[PDB]
Enzyme design. Structure first.
Site, short mmCIF file in Angstrom:
data_model
loop_
_atom_site.label_atom_id
_atom_site.label_comp_id
_atom_site.label_asym_id
_atom_site.label_seq_id
_atom_site.Cartn_x
_atom_site.Cartn_y
_atom_site.Cartn_z
N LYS B 201 48.10 36.63 86.74
CA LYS B 201 48.80 37.27 85.61
C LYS B 201 47.83 37.59 84.53
CE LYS B 201 52.58 36.54 82.31
NZ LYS B 201 53.68 35.56 81.88
N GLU B 207 39.46 29.18 88.07
CA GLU B 207 39.43 28.93 89.53
C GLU B 207 39.52 30.22 90.33
OE1 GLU B 207 41.41 27.36 87.22
OE2 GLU B 207 41.80 25.26 87.88
N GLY B 262 54.53 32.39 85.24
CA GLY B 262 53.87 32.10 86.52
C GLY B 262 54.74 31.27 87.47
N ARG B 263 55.34 30.19 86.94
CA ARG B 263 56.17 29.28 87.73
C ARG B 263 57.57 29.84 88.10
NH1 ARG B 263 55.19 27.26 82.83
NH2 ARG B 263 56.89 26.98 81.34
N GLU B 348 56.51 21.32 84.28
CA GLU B 348 55.76 22.22 83.39
C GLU B 348 56.71 22.89 82.38
OE1 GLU B 348 53.61 25.41 85.18
OE2 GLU B 348 52.41 25.68 83.36
N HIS B 379 61.28 5.85 105.96
CA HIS B 379 60.34 4.87 106.48
C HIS B 379 59.37 4.46 105.44
CE1 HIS B 379 61.92 5.45 110.57
NE2 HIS B 379 62.27 6.62 110.05
N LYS B 507 43.00 25.33 80.65
CA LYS B 507 42.20 26.51 81.02
C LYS B 507 40.98 26.77 80.16
CE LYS B 507 45.23 29.20 83.54
NZ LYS B 507 45.92 30.41 83.70
O1 6PG Z 1 53.45 29.77 84.74
C1 6PG Z 1 52.84 28.74 84.99
O2 6PG Z 1 53.35 27.81 85.61
C2 6PG Z 1 51.48 28.51 84.39
O3 6PG Z 1 51.17 29.44 83.32
C3 6PG Z 1 50.29 28.38 85.38
O4 6PG Z 1 50.61 27.64 86.61
C4 6PG Z 1 49.70 29.73 85.84
O5 6PG Z 1 50.57 30.35 86.78
C5 6PG Z 1 48.31 29.57 86.50
O6 6PG Z 1 47.43 29.02 85.48
C6 6PG Z 1 47.71 30.86 87.03
O7 6PG Z 1 47.60 31.79 85.92
P1 6PG Z 1 47.20 33.28 86.26
O8 6PG Z 1 48.27 33.85 87.13
O9 6PG Z 1 47.11 33.92 84.89
O10 6PG Z 1 45.86 33.23 86.95
O1 6PG Z 2 55.39 -0.61 107.91
C1 6PG Z 2 56.11 0.26 107.44
O2 6PG Z 2 55.78 0.94 106.48
C2 6PG Z 2 57.52 0.42 107.95
O3 6PG Z 2 57.96 -0.70 108.76
C3 6PG Z 2 57.87 1.77 108.63
O4 6PG Z 2 57.25 2.95 107.99
C4 6PG Z 2 57.48 1.85 110.12
O5 6PG Z 2 56.07 2.02 110.25
C5 6PG Z 2 58.17 3.03 110.85
O6 6PG Z 2 59.60 2.78 110.78
C6 6PG Z 2 57.77 3.19 112.31
O7 6PG Z 2 58.09 1.96 113.00
P1 6PG Z 2 57.57 1.79 114.49
O8 6PG Z 2 56.08 1.84 114.45
O9 6PG Z 2 58.14 0.45 114.90
O10 6PG Z 2 58.17 2.93 115.28
#
Ligand code: 6PG
Ligand code: 6PG
Ligand code: CA
Ligand code: CA
Lengths: 541, 541
Positions: B201, B207, B262-263, B348, B379, B507
């Protein structure tokens, strides 16, 4: 009778009214006092709302607590997961000390080492082409099928270590029961050249059952011969009897143990998909980096112990400022799944309402962890970090050197990281803003109308953790710092960080709803609350 | 003198002590009262901590506020972005009413329509092969270069509508200054077959400047002829003089206007990358779905107006319960960037500490938005939603029908979604848990020791938003509901949702730090706080 961490004394440390600008102005030793190094990680906590008196008070709480004993208990294999009567031994998965360790009759050193050697052999056999598919073709693709702890760590690490990929295999992750997940893999892989991994500690998780059955049906649709399963599936489980029952033999089964929590499991055989991307040597380096931090945590006095300081700062804020979230800001694209990963490790551990004794606690425990990659977050939610009115502690993760020679980009990335923490600390006053508006050409009426909207209050805290590079080793160290932070917080709150009775309930729910969805004359359907009933009705029609 | 939303009256509505189980038990009209439909979206807010008296009180606040006037002002092009003196006209980008609309001398209907026709022609020319690269080859890849609002909406929508991809082009997103972002695209695309989009914009974002310069250097390294830029770059901006200055001519420049935040910009020419994935016809359907919601919001009495109810619930909780976050749980893999997107749109916008008059407000404004895709979140952080001690409002997004024929997977996905909201509402009492433990074979001592750890308190609120499918149209409707929720909250808080003076500061920061990094004898380096100085020193050595 445990020590109370969030007590009246903490609530009152805040009355020191720390002004960060004033502290850096007056104290030429501020950074020296409030930073630590571990090998090539620099931990700078000096932009936090602390001074010597506050840090001393917090460290006294740690010293007065059971923490010293609990660290020893964890490493020694005591059953600190008290509600499931289990040891908590993710540390042992990466051990390099080789000290004696016998738990529930098993030589843990021997068990861990033998299983690593089996995973290493599998990876080598597959990558070398000694392992062939059922039609004799070399494997080109690996599909991990698992969810939660059996998915997210490997997925995050595979991305984070993308520059180190070196096996000529593409590794894919299938997790959600939503079949979009399975299809994203199946659309790009060939049954004759794909090895499927069923990653499940319990071997009874709904999503992983359905996904594995569907994958097997895909494989067999192609081959039309059950014998092909042998060349195209391996399993990772603590429940080997259940694997056999699915059709995979013991020689194709890889072990983990009850003392490996899912959310602390990437270090185990569950990490095989990481090895299949980066090779086993790099997987060993990942583990060694975690070991380095384990040794640091186990051996270092609390005042110089990085995870302990991380934990004390976090719990101090969430106690004294009544904050309900923390932001984690990784300034590297490779860390795009790191917040998601730590969100699981942290919130699933410390989202608990009762203490070890089963008593409902009268203080807040784990808070929400969130964040996003920098610099992108600066364009989005950093607005709220700078000008919202929510108190949010912030961690930045910076990587000094990247994996390419676009040095101008890397310098800008770091400059932005450091600028953001600096801006959180200083802000911009009305007078500064007003004078800048006049200098830009606004007249006095215009500058007065706008200035208050540009004020940035500042005096907002941050930590910066700076790595030299993002290597297998440094990533392993980084994850382990947070593992231990979470442990320390749980200790100080007197909770069990290692159970998950809300996740366990989740795995059993809605069998009732499925039954109701399939038969509106059932008891299940009749007993529904009407919100659930009308949602089901809407997905029928 | 605006109406105060978070007043004593709200703080006291909580004293109704709503018990959700009791409400559904006693009120056979609960769902009818507390659900709404808009076309094929079902909005079920009946599991929220409300009854008739609370909802009435909240709606009175909306009726007493300036909201009715502010809705009209937004659509009519009044300068409701009061600090930048701009209209707020993302609605106009998707208009189908064709009512007269003249803002700052421009016929907005004509401007919007003409620019759409230009984007449509570009997409058609590229997809048909009429547009060739400089060496005469058909384009196969599109790379969008932009950050924040110029990145995340298109990226999220391209993923969300993956099943609708139909142009034979691969679309890639480069955003972060971290060169990993640019490299992920450049590693998989050929300069002779790639069209690069500079989306900015302002045309002055650090960046996007660095990324665009680097991309141009890559292109010219290949071709060694400046004339190739003509076939390989287009720009999207409100600042056309700055585009010319970069080397792109006006015929390759696509417009947006100052009144497109922008958003809130994916609906504008910034969405060209979406059209390049899904075709222009599907892009028109995305816009039409948003229009449907715009008409709903603009025309519907507050008691039946989905965005208004969303906003009133959210602000009620964050006022009365002092909650500091909200969780958003999309039960579809395709919505994997949806939380990230809304995190920007919401935080934002409403992370603001002063009101329209510039006065520091004495009530909390925007809170943290977070979440994660289901079923995977079950999980992980759902543990904290079920058994933590943080009050967190929860939205679930469910999709009745997916894009495949794995009907068992889809049924399980929905069953889990509905089970989770049901479990938040009911929980599990000590008595229920204890009796289940006895039935499982535990003796009385064992059951007493464990039961408190399994108690799930329940009475936790949720909303479920159910779509018939995830199509271009329904996705556009879904995003627009949240756009308007955010607007309503801002109105009720008397803030400006449409500026971002924290993002604007971001910025401009760290030019100073870059200068310091490149010359340690500079004033910039000397004036640094020592935390920043020692971080810079560490990335030198
Ligand atoms: O609207 C928004 O959320 C912000 O202003 C911002 O996220 C913006 O989009 C970026 O900084 C890119 O800006 P340009 O499009 O100007 O490069
Ligand atoms: O340790 C953990 O964070 C939880 O217990 C859970 O995220 C678990 O990893 C999944 O439910 C898969 O379980 P299984 O590996 O037994 O399929
Ligand atoms: Ca002691
Ligand atoms: Ca009125």
């Amino acid at each position: 009778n445990a020590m109370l961490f969030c007590d009246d004394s903490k609530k009152y440390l805040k009355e020191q009214n720390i002004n960060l600008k004033n502290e850096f102005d007056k104290d030429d030793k501020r950074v020296e006092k409030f930073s630590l190094k571990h090998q090539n990680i620099y931990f700078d906590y000096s932009k936090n709302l602390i001074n010597d008196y506050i840090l001393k008070s917090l460290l006294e709480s740690a010293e007065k607590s059971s923490l010293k004993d609990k660290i020893k208990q964890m490493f020694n294999g005591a059953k600190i997961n008290s509600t499931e009567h289990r040891a908590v031994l993710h540390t042992a998965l990466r051990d390099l000390s080789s000290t004696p360790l016998i738990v529930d009759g098993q030589d843990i050193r021997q068990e861990v080492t033998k299983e690593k050697q089996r995973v290493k052999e599998l990876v080598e056999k597959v990558v070398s082409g000694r392992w062939r598919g059922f039609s004799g073709k070399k494997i080109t693709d690996i599909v991990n099928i698992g969810i939660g702890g059996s998915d997210l760590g490997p997925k995050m690490v595979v991305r984070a270590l993308q520059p180190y990929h070196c096996t000529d295999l593409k590794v894919h992750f299938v997790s959600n029961v939503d079949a979009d997940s399975l299809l994203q893999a199946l659309h790009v892989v060939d049954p004759e050249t794909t090895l499927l991994i069923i990653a499940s500690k319990s071997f009874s998780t709904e999503e992983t059952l359905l996904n594995s059955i569907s994958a097997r049906e895909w494989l067999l649709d192609h081959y039309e011969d059950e014998k092909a399963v042998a060349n195209h599936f391996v399993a990772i489980s603590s429940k080997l009897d259940k694997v056999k029952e699915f059709g995979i033999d013991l020689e194709h089964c890889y072990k983990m143990w009850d003392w490996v929590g899912g959310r602390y499991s990437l270090w185990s055989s569950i990490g095989m998909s990481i090895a299949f991307a980066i090779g086993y040597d790099n997987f060993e380096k990942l583990l060694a980096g975690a070991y380095s931090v384990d040794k640091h945590f186990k051996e270092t006095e609390f005042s110089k112990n990085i995870p302990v300081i991380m934990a004390l700062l976090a719990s101090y804020y969430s106690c004294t400022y009544n904050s309900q979230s923390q932001a984690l800001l990784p300034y590297d694209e490779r860390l795009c799944y790191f917040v998601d990963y730590l969100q699981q490790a942290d919130m699933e551990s410390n989202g608990k309402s009762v203490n070890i004794a089963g008593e409902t606690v009268n203080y807040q425990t784990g808070v929400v962890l969130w964040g996003g990659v920098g610099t992108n977050g600066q364009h989005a939610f950093h607005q709220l970090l700078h000008q919202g009115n929510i108190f949010i502690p912030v961690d930045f993760i910076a990587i000094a050197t990247s994996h390419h020679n676009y040095d101008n980009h890397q310098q800008a990335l770091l400059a932005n990281c450091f600028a953001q923490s600096q801006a959180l600390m200083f802000g911009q006053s009305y007078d500064m803003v007003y004078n800048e508006l006049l200098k830009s050409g606004l007249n006095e009426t215009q500058a007065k109308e706008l200035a208050a909207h540009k004020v940035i209050p500042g005096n907002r805290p941050s930590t910066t953790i700076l790595l030299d590079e993002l290597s297998p080793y440094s990533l392993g160290a980084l994850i382990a710092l947070y593992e231990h932070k979470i442990f320390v917080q749980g200790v100080l709150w007197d909770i069990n960080s290692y159970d998950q009775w809300g996740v366990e309930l989740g795995k059993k729910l809605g069998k009732n709803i499925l039954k109701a969805m399939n038969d509106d004359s059932s008891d299940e359907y009749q007993n529904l609350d009407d919100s659930t009933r009308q949602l089901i009705a809407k997905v029928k029609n």
